[PDB]
Amino acid sequence: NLYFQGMLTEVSDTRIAHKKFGLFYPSVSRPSIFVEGEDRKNFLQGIASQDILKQDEKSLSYSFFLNPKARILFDAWCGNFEDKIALFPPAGTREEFVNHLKKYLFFRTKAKITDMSDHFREIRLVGPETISVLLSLFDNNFSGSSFRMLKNGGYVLIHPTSFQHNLDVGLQADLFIPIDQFETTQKSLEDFTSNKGGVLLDESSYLAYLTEKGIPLFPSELNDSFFPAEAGLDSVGVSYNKGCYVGQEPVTRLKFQGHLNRSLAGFRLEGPKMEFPVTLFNPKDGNEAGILTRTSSSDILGSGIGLGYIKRNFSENGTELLLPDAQLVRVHSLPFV
Numbered sequence: 562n563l564y565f566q567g568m569l570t571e572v573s574d575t576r577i578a579h580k581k582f583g584l585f586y587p588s589v590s591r592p593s594i595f596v597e598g599e600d601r602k603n604f605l606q607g608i609a610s611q612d613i614l615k616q617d618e619k620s621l622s623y624s625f626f627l628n629p630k631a632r633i634l635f636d637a638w639c640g641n642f643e644d645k646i647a648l649f650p651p652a653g654t655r656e657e658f659v660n661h662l663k664k665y666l667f668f669r670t671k672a673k674i675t676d677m678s679d680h681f682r683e684i685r686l687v688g689p690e691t692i693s694v695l696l697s698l699f700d701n702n703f704s705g706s707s708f709r710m711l712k713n714g715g716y717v718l719i720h721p722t723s724f725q726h727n728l729d730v731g732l733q734a735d736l737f738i739p740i741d742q743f744e745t746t747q748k749s750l751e752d753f754t755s756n757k758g759g760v761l762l763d764e765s766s767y768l769a770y771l772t773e774k775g776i777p778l779f780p781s782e783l784n785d786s787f788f789p790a791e792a793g794l795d796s797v798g799v800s801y802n803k804g805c806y807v808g809q810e811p812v813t814r815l816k817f818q819g820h821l822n823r824s825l826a827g828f829r830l831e832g833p834k835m836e837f838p839v840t841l842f843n844p845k846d847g848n849e850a851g852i853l854t855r856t857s858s859s860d861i862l863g864s865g866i867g868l869g870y871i872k873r874n875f876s877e878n879g880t881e882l883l884l885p886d887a888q889l890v891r892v893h894s895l896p897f898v
């Protein structure tokens with residue numbers, strides 16, 4: 562008998578983002594890494610888990626960068642523009658990500674890497690009216706899984722609407738605005754928000770919104786302890802038809818012959834203290850059943866929610882597990898909202 566009847570006022574404004582749109586200004590944006598040169602495509606194709614060659618001109622693709630054992634080192638959004646490949650690795654990885662690419666940039670490979678991260682400020686949009694907000698600020702047209710250069714400079718990433726376990730997680734757009742145009746774009750967005758009833762999300766409400774959509778993130782759910790298929794992201798981040806790449810054989814073996822021991826799961830719990838990842842225990846025998854990787858409050862669900870990994874024998878919705886202090890968590894369907 563768990564209390565999932567609560568009022569969690571600190572994240573009540575995700576409701577507006579789910580119905581209209583939410584605006585978020587990250588403190589640390591994803592880096593903006595560009596790859597140029599005659600061998601840029603072959604170079605990146607051999608290290609990304611995604612098929613970069615097949616990708617069209619204004620398309621966006623998700624990829625992992627794996628180690629040789631197929632554990633996740635990074636994720637990135639990947640776009641093409643002119644004779645360049647644009648890569649957006651996770652926030653705070655600009656040096657480590659560039660070093661990882663240079664590890665595979667061998668003698669006489671015709672590719673060059675440039676870090677353009679200080680040229681842009683990131684603004685994020687979420688929710689059903691995201692395209693209408695873009696159409697107001699900018700000209701031409703927009704759709705899911707797209708990568709566009711803005712006429713003024715800068716870029717727009719519109720994520721695919723399907724993400725973990727091919728679930729529809731709604732619209733998400735990332736705007737990389739040239740520094741000198743930032744304060745103007747911000748003023749334009751504040752007017753649009755106030756007039757059209759969207760909401761300015763703070764970091765805790767932005768994270769609650771993403772957790773309500775079941776979205777796994779680097780470094781909590783996506784890191785070198787896990788495989789892309791464990792994370793529910795091999796359908797959007799891995800190609801099983803492409804040629805040689807780092808981690809390909811273990812990725813493929815897991816898929817066709819191996820057995821997935823654990824999988825990304827949603828959790829519901831009652832009502833900052835916990836040290837993540839937290840071990841989850843089976844109440845019957847006290848054995849390890851999974852791990853909880855992050856939590857948020859959800860006013861919509863009236864309880865805490867979280868993401869993590871569940872062993873196969875406990876994956877059914879409604880399965881009850883224990884935290885180390887014996888608070889109960891219940892496996893829940895994704896997305897939560």
Ligand SMILES: [Cl-]
Pocket residue numbers: 627628629807
């Ligand atoms: Cl590696």
Ligand SMILES: [Cl-]
Pocket residue numbers: 672673674675
């Ligand atoms: Cl270089």
Ligand SMILES: [Cl-]
Pocket residue numbers: 704705706720721722723
């Ligand atoms: Cl899409």
Ligand SMILES: [Cl-]
Pocket residue numbers: 823850851852870871872
């Ligand atoms: Cl586990």
